[model samples]
Target: FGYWCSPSPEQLERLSLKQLAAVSNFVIGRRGYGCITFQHDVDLTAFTKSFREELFGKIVIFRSSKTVEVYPDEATKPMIGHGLNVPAIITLENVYPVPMKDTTKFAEFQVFDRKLRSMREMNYISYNPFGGTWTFKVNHFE
Candidate 1:
């Protein structure tokens, strides 16, 4: 159900250049995720323009892949294995990581629609029902 990723460090180090390239190609050929981070004191908060930003003093990530197609009927299909074929949407959660100085003990973060647009505010006692699951209406279909 999964794919062959890198091998144990010891085994990988033993491989010849050709073999190592083979393994690297194997993983790179598959579609998923790769990340890059910066190691500096650049005040990462500045790099983030909105909800998505990887700037100085922060670990940045880039998502690259083939566009996925979702059949309307796919909603009824069972998600098997890696579920790569399944059409899924991601939503921002209520929890966010903040710097030590800006940390909140019990903060209920803001909710944003699929458009990257902010949703209505939530009072401490109130909950936005759609915070968990939402169907993006052609919203920031990133």
Candidate 2:
């Protein structure tokens, strides 16, 4: 992702999924941008079917080179707008790459999501910020 104001592979790997998507040297503005997505092709079939609308109707993008930024469509605008400003949570979700595959390589990510959902309470998590391990938390509300 260089030359076009894009990231190199090593640099891109370090970037958070959101940052990678918003890139312009590689990313574009078809209203937004695009980012790399990984999936096993096996699990993808199910995930897409389950969230068909979200998978297709809502996800629109402009991919150039390898960068992509997928944002919500017009139908989702109201909920996303929050009157004037987009909610922090919505912004995060809107920009986040919906996971699909690499379930083996990315299993830790799956565990993190499960932990928060199953616990049903806000939790604090600790992990090596140096990429030692991956742990996730959710600010609970119930």
Candidate 3:
């Protein structure tokens, strides 16, 4: 995820059993706003296939920019734009079900969801704070 919004019980319940089972095996980003996901130690191909079908037309974005190098290991590297090209970032919008289990390494489930709500005012989330969903930008020509 480059961004994430929590899902509701109604939204979860609306999913078919097949979809639910398929999604339940993996966890979304721990912090609900990051660039990584947690999952059982397993191959991604099969999981990816299922997701491809589930979120067929979902919007995705690419973002990247350069930053100065400060790591000790790149000591002798060029100091111009500085060290290396930043990795191209891929961000998905509404691409998967929200995490209802272990939300993070130290925090999990409703506790974390509640915290997300408290961070913003009611209008900040969606129709309401409890709505949790947000508008995802879609770019066609990117």
Candidate 4:
């Protein structure tokens, strides 16, 4: 069984901020970018290792409450989210922006997981299985 309904653009416009934040967080978490927490320690050694192995050539986005930061490559200073207090490391290649209205479809959870897996398995970047309405598009500390 399936049900289909469309939300009004007026309602969508009203909720954009909330939805954007929520969607951004969801994408960050689902993609294994980082975690959500308050003041905590980041394991620099582990981060360094990951950077060397997985993140070296990738573009990573860091999302914080105050602002969004972007790291183009490994030469850039390595840091997590705001105050090292938020999440980090969304690969630009792995994410794209979809309309808020289109998020209601079923099977997204499984599909998204599979897409990430495929990317990793293929050792590829800049390929998004779910083509987005907006183009692909973070940061921080000492």
Candidate 5:
């Protein structure tokens, strides 16, 4: 199973090139793995949703700079920046970009509640490291 993350615009801007490079190095050392830090406990439902058996090998989507990144795998521990304590960290493996379309079908919510019941029932899972849920309404493509 995989996750979906959207980093805050402010935090994204706060990161420096040097920090990015360092993080990239760490990921490379781990054989293409990184984490998305969160400020609070992840919604339990959202977490469980990703664990559904059929979702294995699905890509974790990261929305940044108006484009989305497709990643493989999720980490069980915080493996992002070193020496930085965070409330939660959803780790991901590998990374590749996909441009966002002008007319793309998407779904988002601050939490997984009744509003997402139907979507969940349909086997669609989402995870936002910044505290929410978001996902593209599309199949996991190779």
Candidate 6:
């Protein structure tokens, strides 16, 4: 058997502030995934650091859970849903906008995660990654 997420834009918009705070708590509370990453935006200063840790989920700016946890190079393959092609993960770029000309931190985020993982049990910190200066990652995780 196969399974996937099928939440809608309107549904996401309705998430409560309390729900947003502990997003990781309710998401993975279901099944299949051992974790659910929430994203948020950050300055160049944050991205340049080394590998970070995860409180309950991984937060990123440019890089995505699909890219980090699933593949290394392939642009994520979308699962057709409601007659539309959609990635299996929560794309939060639209909700967490990042400025233009900000891809420099893209690669560095991974570098930071990897470094932190190596040192900190390889579990990334709980965070909310923004789409970043490039407009890649999505902006909603509700």
Best by TM-score: 4
User: Candidate 2 residues 7-123, lDDT tens each?
Assistant: 333344554545543433331122222222221111112122223243332342334322223343444333322211121111112221144333355566556555544543323
C-alpha lDDT of residue 50 in model 2 = 28
Q: Which stretches of candidate 3 lie over 4 Å from their true place?
A: 1-107, 121-142
- TM-score for predicted model 1 compared with the true structure: 0.20
lDDT of 2: 0.30
Model 6 residue runs over 4 Å out of place are 6-30, 41-68, 72-142
RMSD of each: 16.8, 17.1, 17.6, 16.3, 15.3, 17.5
Q: List the candidates ranked by lDDT, beginning with the highest.
A: 4, 5, 2, 6, 3, 1
Off by over 4 Å in 4: 1-97, 100-104, 121-142
**Per-residue accuracy of model 3 over 58-92 as CA lDDT, tens digit each:** 32112222111112233323333211111222222
Per-model CA lDDT versus the true structure: 0.25, 0.30, 0.28, 0.31, 0.30, 0.28
Residues 26-58, candidate 6: write the lDDT tens digits: 221112223223332111121122212211123
Ranking by TM-score: 4, 1, 5, 6, 2, 3
Encode model 1's per-residue lDDT on 17-41: one tens digit a residue.
4443333321111113221111111
Clashes of 5: 0
TM-scores, all candidates, are: 0.20, 0.18, 0.17, 0.22, 0.20, 0.19
lDDT of 1: 0.25
Tell me the deviation in Å of residue 38 in model 1: 21
- Quote the positional error of residue 139 for candidate 4 in Å: 18
Model 5 TM-score, 2 decimals: 0.20
Off by over 4 Å in 2: 1-49, 56-62, 65-69, 79-142
Q: After superposition, how far is residue 89 of candidate 2 from its true place, in Å?
A: 12
